[PDB]
Structure 1
Amino acid sequence: METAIWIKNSKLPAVLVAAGAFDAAVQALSKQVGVVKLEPLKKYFTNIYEGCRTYIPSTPCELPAQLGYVRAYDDTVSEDQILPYVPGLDVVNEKMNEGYKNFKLNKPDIAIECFREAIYRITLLMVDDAEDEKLAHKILETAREYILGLSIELERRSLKEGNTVRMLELAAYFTKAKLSPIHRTNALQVAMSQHFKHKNFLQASYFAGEFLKIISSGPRAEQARKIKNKADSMASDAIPIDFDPYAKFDICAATYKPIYEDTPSVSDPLTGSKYVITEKDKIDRIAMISKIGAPASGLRIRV
């Protein structure tokens, strides 16, 4: 009877999953966040269903063990709040912190795995709170920005020497990802020294200046200052690239090109990443479960 209490009290995808109503949960995710590829969510469905269940020994032990349920709240709440226990934002923050740790250690694939996991956990959250709901959305957008920047940098690294313009463009677009300032420092350092190496002194000076307004002391700040001094003395760019730091644009999460306000674009309804128009109906690169440009009613995590 517990499962039907759950479903009567909330149709959140998390609650449907906990109840075993996998099909109804998949349909709800389809309408709400455009979910279309299911495999990357399997573990998470599994995690929820088994996380709110526990097994006590029977008498005798040969008899199958008996199933009990872990609820969301203790018994002091009304009957319409009888809800499954679903792990919350504190685990999500742990996954994000592991992402940041792998980012600092220059393990970008593993960082991406961590940010993707936090996104999948947020897709199946249950909060009871306007502040937790807003916090969940902000973390989701942050994880997307970290995945986007890391994917730009992995593309840059994958490049054959001789794709110098594409490489310098990617180095620049990496600085556009909305990481924390201390993390944006990594991208600015890449962009600065790659543009300096390739005789793009105007670019190098911009990236060095942006670096120095976050980190002002230490040996990287001094490297940045001497790079900026030399670059300001040269005041030239050997290789023009499509990049205006003062314009308003986003980066296409599939082709890694700037999308200006007049550029026709579509977006992923789940992660909010943006794409050039030829990516409509394809699967989002950030989390790889939802359909770019699909009609969607919006993420539901608030009971």
Structure 2
Amino acid sequence: PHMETAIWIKNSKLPAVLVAAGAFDAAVQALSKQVGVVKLEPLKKYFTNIYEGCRTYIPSTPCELPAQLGYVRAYDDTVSEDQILPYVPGLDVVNEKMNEGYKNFKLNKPDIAIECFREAIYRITLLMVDDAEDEKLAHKILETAREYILGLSIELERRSLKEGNTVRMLELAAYFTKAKLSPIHRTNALQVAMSQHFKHKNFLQASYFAGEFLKIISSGPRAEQARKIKNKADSMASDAIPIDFDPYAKFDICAATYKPIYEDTPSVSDPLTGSKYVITEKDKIDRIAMISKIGAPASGLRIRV
């Protein structure tokens, strides 16, 4: 709240700047009305980084004197004294983290991958952007990030099942297929689904999934199995175990219960993530990034200066 600091708060009251100006409460209150942020713990590191990220110390003369604070501004000498704001690491890094995510997805470490996407969702939350392309993009990334957190959260919950629940396990391995990931990655979802529906003589899906996969992978080791599986399966339209899954339908997967939310089905959204849940979940925290209240009303994520 000093000579420099004041300019900042005077020039922009968006969270990121509030945080950098050392006005934490003000920021906490803004993220609350804007994105429905309620649980603060997994957000400390981010408040800290923003704050320390725009401050640097140069040594004082008699060395045993404490160093002098210097501020790192967002722009250079040639800018309206109006547009004097703090430096806040922007999207360069949001991507860097989104990639760590993908790297960990190919490696098969959902835990460590979900950890990344969450981080990118946090950095987007306290981002500071000037162009409108970047603001549009920030949201695009946020969208994806949750689709991967959601898709993996489903694969995880599926892996957490003890035999005997094979009805539900086939239900999940199918829903994972509905997580709007990039095709290249959706492959592993299809393969998991396609192969589990095969294993339990449910070639009605087994065939579906396999084909839905082959149409993204011409040839290769794994792609070749997809073929051999789609044939054998196609020759016996079996329905071993019918599941609550309609590929010819429109629905979203509840990020909490992992049951499908059809167009009628009453649902509530998460102000920040946008993930969808059944009314049962109203007023609890979202599973995509334990920060916001489901259904609480918000006035929009404020990223742009």
The TM-score by the shorter chain falls in which range?
over 0.9
CA distance in 2, matches of 1:246, 1:164: 23
* Aligned-pair CA distance for 1:178: 0.7
Structure 1 residue 241 displacement after superposition: 0.3
Deviations 1:62-121 (A, max 9, x none): 111100000000111110110000000010000000000000000110000000000000
Looking at structure 2, the residues matched to 24 and 106 of structure 1 have their Cα atoms a distance apart, in angstroms, of 40
Shift in Å at residue 237 of structure 1? 1.2
In 1, Cα distance between the equivalents of 2:229 and 2:48? Answer: 52
User: Cα deviations across residues 27-84 of structure 1 (Å, max 9, x unaligned)?
Assistant: 0000000000000000000000000000011111111110000000011111011000
Alignment partners' CA distance in 2, 1:245 and 1:110? 30
Distance 1:136 1:41 in 2: 18
Q: Where does the alignment leave 5 or more consecutive residues of structure 2 unmatched?
A: none
Structure 2 partner of 1:88? 90
Q: What do the CA deviations read for 1:231-278 (whole angstroms, capped 9, x no partner)?
A: 110111110000001111000000001001100000100000000001
Determine the C-alpha separation between the residues in 2 that align with 1:49 and 1:75: 22
| Unpaired stretches in structure 1, ≥5 consecutive residues | none
Which of 6, 16, 19 is 1:17 aligned to?
A: 19
Q: TM-score, normalised by structure 2?
A: 0.99
In angstroms, what is the RMSD of aligned CA positions? 0.5
- Identity, in percent, stands at 100
Distance in 2 of aligned mates of 1:46 and 1:258: 39
Query: Alignment partner of 1:175: what SS?
Result: helix
Give the whole-Å Cα distance in 2 for the aligned partners of 1:30 and 1:170: 33
Whole-Å Cα distance in 2 between the matches of residues 68 and 247 of structure 1? 58
User: Which 4+ stretches in 1 moved above 3 angstroms?
Assistant: none
- Partner secondary structure for residue 218 of structure 2: coil
Q: CA deviation at 1:217?
A: 0.7
State how far apart, in whole Å, the 1-side matches of 2:300 and 2:224 are.
Answer: 47
Please name the residue that 1:140 is paired with.
142
Structure 1 residue 165: Cα displacement: 0.8
3-state SS of 1:234 partner: coil
Q: Report how many residues are paired.
A: 303
What is the TM-score when the length of structure 1 is the normalising length? Answer: 0.99
Please give the per-residue CA displacement for 1:124-150, whole angstroms capped at 9, x wherever unaligned: 000001100010000000000000000
